[PDB]
Amino acid sequence: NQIDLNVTCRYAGVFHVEKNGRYSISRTEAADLCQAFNSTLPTMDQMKLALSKGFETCRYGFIEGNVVIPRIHPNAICAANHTGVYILVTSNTSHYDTYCFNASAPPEEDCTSVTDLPNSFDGPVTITIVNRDGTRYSKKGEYRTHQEDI
């Protein structure tokens, strides 16, 4: 019973979380997942400020109100070569990665590793935070509050 959470650098508190190496997070799960990091889904303004500090990914993820990809450098296979916060407009499907926002993180680029999941609750899952540098933090718990996400 294991969940891998790949996480990034934070940029003005905003970071990306990919679950189990595939688009697998629902909007309800995303809010619960960010809550386990004492975080919330970023607002569009928070995400735009993170972008300005150096944040970009090549993956769709929830923010408050939309599913987006922050892009700095145009890449044909990431958000159809767009720059800025690219907003997904048309999709059949509901599961993506998520972004999270931690107000207590540093104001600009923070590329230290994540070493805690501070607000997970008691539960049976081995949750492993996987940093981009491969360092890992694991803890037994749960963060999903909606049965349909389990």
User: What is the binding site for ligand 8AB (CB under 6 A)?
Assistant: 52-54, 72, 109
Q: Closer CB to ligand 8AB, residue 8 or residue 120?
A: 8
Report in angstroms how near the CB of residue 22 gets to ligand 8AB at its nearest.
25
Q: Which is nearer to ligand 8AB, 72 or 150 (by Cβ)?
A: 72
Which residues have a Cβ under 8 Å from the Cβ of 94 and sit 6 or more positions away? 26, 27
**Do residues 41 and 64 make contact, with C-beta atoms less than 8 angstroms apart?**
yes
- Residue 22, annotated as binding a ligand: yes
Residue 109 or 149 having the CB closest to ligand 8AB: 109
Q: What CA–CA distance (Å, rounded) separates 124 from 131? A: 22
Beta carbons of 117 and 124 less than 8 angstroms apart: no
* Torsional class of 49: left (φ above 0), alpha (ψ -120 to 50), beta (otherwise): alpha
- Sequential DSSP letters for 94-119: --BEEEEE-TTS-SSEE-SPP---TT
Q: How far is the CB of 70 from ligand 8AB (least distance, A)?
A: 10
Tell me the residue number closest to ligand 8AB, measured at CB: 54
Q: Is 86 annotated as a binding residue?
A: yes
Which CB atom, from 54 or from 123, has the smaller least distance to ligand 8AB?
54
Which amino acids are annotated as binding site for hyaluronan, given as ranges? 22, 59-60, 86
Which amino acids are annotated as binding site, given as ranges? 22, 59-60, 86
